[PDB]
Amino acid sequence: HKSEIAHRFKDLGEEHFKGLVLIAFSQYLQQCPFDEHVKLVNELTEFAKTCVADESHAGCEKSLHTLFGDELCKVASLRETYGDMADCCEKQEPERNECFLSHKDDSPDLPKLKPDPNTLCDEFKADEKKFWGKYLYEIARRHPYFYAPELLYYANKYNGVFQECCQAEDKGACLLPKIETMREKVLTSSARQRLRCASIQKFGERALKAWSVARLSQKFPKAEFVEVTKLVTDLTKVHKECCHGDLLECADDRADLAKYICDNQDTISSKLKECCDKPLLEKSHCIAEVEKDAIPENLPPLTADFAEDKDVCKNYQEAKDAFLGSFLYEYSRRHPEYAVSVLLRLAKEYEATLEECCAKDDPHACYSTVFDKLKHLVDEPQNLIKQNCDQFEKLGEYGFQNALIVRYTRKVPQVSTPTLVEVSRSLGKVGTRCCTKPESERMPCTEDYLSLILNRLCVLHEKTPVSEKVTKCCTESLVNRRPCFSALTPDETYVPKAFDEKLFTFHADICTLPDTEKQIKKQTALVELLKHKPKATEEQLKTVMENFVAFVDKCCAADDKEACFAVEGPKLVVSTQTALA
Numbered sequence: 001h002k003s004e005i006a007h008r009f010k011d012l013g014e015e016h017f018k019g020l021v022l023i024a025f026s027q028y029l030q031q032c033p034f035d036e037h038v039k040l041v042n043e044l045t046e047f048a049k050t051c052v053a054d055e056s057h058a059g060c061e062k063s064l065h066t067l068f069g070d071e072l073c074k075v076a077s078l079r080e081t082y083g084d085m086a087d088c089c090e091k092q093e094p095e096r097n098e099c100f101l102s103h104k105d106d107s108p109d110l111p112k113l114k115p116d117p118n119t120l121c122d123e124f125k126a127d128e129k130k131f132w133g134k135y136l137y138e139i140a141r142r143h144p145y146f147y148a149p150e151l152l153y154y155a156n157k158y159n160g161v162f163q164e165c166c167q168a169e170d171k172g173a174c175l176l177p178k179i180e181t182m183r184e185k186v187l188t189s190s191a192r193q194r195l196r197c198a199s200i201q202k203f204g205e206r207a208l209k210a211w212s213v214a215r216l217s218q219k220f221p222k223a224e225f226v227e228v229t230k231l232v233t234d235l236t237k238v239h240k241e242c243c244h245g246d247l248l249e250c251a252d253d254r255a256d257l258a259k260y261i262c263d264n265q266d267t268i269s270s271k272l273k274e275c276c277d278k279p280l281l282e283k284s285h286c287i288a289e290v291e292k293d294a295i296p297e298n299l300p301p302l303t304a305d306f307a308e309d310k311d312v313c314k315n316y317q318e319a320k321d322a323f324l325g326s327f328l329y330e331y332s333r334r335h336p337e338y339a340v341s342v343l344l345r346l347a348k349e350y351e352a353t354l355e356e357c358c359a360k361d362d363p364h365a366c367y368s369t370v371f372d373k374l375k376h377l378v379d380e381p382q383n384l385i386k387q388n389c390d391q392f393e394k395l396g397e398y399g400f401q402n403a404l405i406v407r408y409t410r411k412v413p414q415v416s417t418p419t420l421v422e423v424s425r426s427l428g429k430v431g432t433r434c435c436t437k438p439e440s441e442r443m444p445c446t447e448d449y450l451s452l453i454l455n456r457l458c459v460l461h462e463k464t465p466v467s468e469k470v471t472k473c474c475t476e477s478l479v480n481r482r483p484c485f486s487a488l489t490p491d492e493t494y495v496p497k498a499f500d501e502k503l504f505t506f507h508a509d510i511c512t513l514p515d516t517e518k519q520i521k522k523q524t525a526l527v528e529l530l531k532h533k534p535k536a537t538e539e540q541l542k543t544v545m546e547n548f549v550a551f552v553d554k555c556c557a558a559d560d561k562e563a564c565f566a567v568e569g570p571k572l573v574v575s576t577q578t579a580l581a
């Protein structure tokens with residue numbers, strides 16, 4: 001293929017090709033209408049055909065970055081709509097693309113899609129392929145780093161829901177639990193992916209390679225260290241690809257990996273037959289979430305290769321990363337039950353122990369007892385879960401969430417009120433995800449989800465920074481991010497924010513609000529309280545929360561919504577300044 005774009009079309013087929021390109025446009029230019037995007041997609045798609053006929057046509061030898069980028073620069077409303085993004089056009093590739101990426105909005109502030117059974121069913125029966133595409137649109141433009149192939153898979157599943165439910169009688173009661181389930185999976189899938197993109201973009205491939213080794217050695221402990229390095233290499237490239245935005249190349253390599261993995265399951269995992277039956281995209285999804293394989297029986301103890309062994313310092317100096325990779329693998333395959341995040345912590349620690357012990361007099365005497373500083377980092381996470389699950393069960397979801405709001409607002413009062421609300425809400429849902437799960441399954445479940453959610457915090461923060469505490473924690477480590485935040489305590493350095501009455505005014509429009517957006521208004525007010533009076537003991541906040549509730553309820557159900565929020569509102573406000581010294 002003297003022509004990359006031709007290659008892609010051949011390799012992917014029109015349907016997906018057309019999808020991935022719409023995703024890309026939707027991800028770079030996030031506030032453009034669906035229509036205007038569809039347009040560009042066909043333009044690029046027609047041309048793609050030109051090149052598959054004539055690999056030698058003018059332009060075909062151009063990179064997919066050049067090509068796609070040139071198209072972006074032709075959008076006429078682009079400076080108007082996107083600002084300093086228009087300036088990226090003045091630049092050569094690959095600086096141009098890099099500039100485009102950096103203008104991707106991680107918090108895009110677009111209407112929260114509140115789905116109507118009846119109307120959505122109409123669009124489906126009408127245009128199934130436009131409906132599918134508009135899904136692709138609306139997700140991708142809200143998740144500009146969403147793993148492109150996986151979002152294809154999700155559009156599929158979304159179609160499978162609507163194709164089935166619009167024929168049931170009570171369409172709504174059929175589909176609405178289904179769209180709700182998926183939604184969580186999609187946000188999880190988004191979160192996971194943005195953490196992959198932040199690994200590479202902020203800590204190098206090295207970082208994301210290790211994230212991999214770990215996870216894969218757990219999935220396929222029956223695989224050689226050779227195999228796993230091949231497998232990793234491949235999957236990192238896919239992820240490097242989807243992150244820098246060459247989505248077609250991404251979707252390709254990923255499918256090539258799926259093909260390879262099934263073409264080799266004999267030297268990877270017994271758990272693969274079920275996956276290696278499916279259609280293209282279903283297959284890859286199933287491989288991702290495969291059952292782990294039984295750990296091989298008679299493996300030596302670790303303590304033999306990496307502590308008892310004589311020439312460990314030596315091997316470590318010979319192939320720094322290989323040796324360390326080796327560790328990560330041997331340790332990862334043995335212990336499926338550890339969280340990935342923990343396993344990697346063990347790895348950096350091991351690295352630290354060797355790096356200190358090697359430049360010493362009697363290096364063996366020093367490193368012999370590494371598995372000692374090592375056990376010490378499997379217990380640290382273990383006690384802080386105990387508390388959380390003790391607290392979740394004793395407070396319920398929304399209640400635990402509010403406790404977290406308080407802890408976080410104290411920890412880093414600096415951070416944007418909107419961020420603290422969204423973050424604390426997600427740390428909350430972790431209770432309901434994990435504490436339910438079997439006592440010993442607990443710590444890994446929580447370690448993974450916190451990994452994502454904390455990254456979300458770092459991602460919103462890095463953009464427009466405020467807390468050196470947040471930044472220090474976000475940048476100093478990737479693995480030790482979670483401990484780093486637990487460590488933080490409130491700042492006597494924090495001068496309390498002044499009283500602003502608009503932060504604690506409640507209009508009769510609090511009863512219009514849905515349950516979710518109702519708690520948010522409430523939770524926001526909690527933050528703005530803790531921000532104004534940071535010293536206030538939960539003693540007081542207790543009756544303050546009981547008080548908003550004494551009031552929201554007394555008016556939202558009063559004879560005249562407003563005459564209440566009118567007079568009874570200011571009452572509450574004078575109240576709480578008398579309440580909080």
Ligand SMILES: [Au+]
Nearest residue numbers: 031032077081
């Ligand atoms: Au636009």
Ligand SMILES: [Mg+2]
Nearest residue numbers: 063064065246
């Ligand atoms: Mg390329």
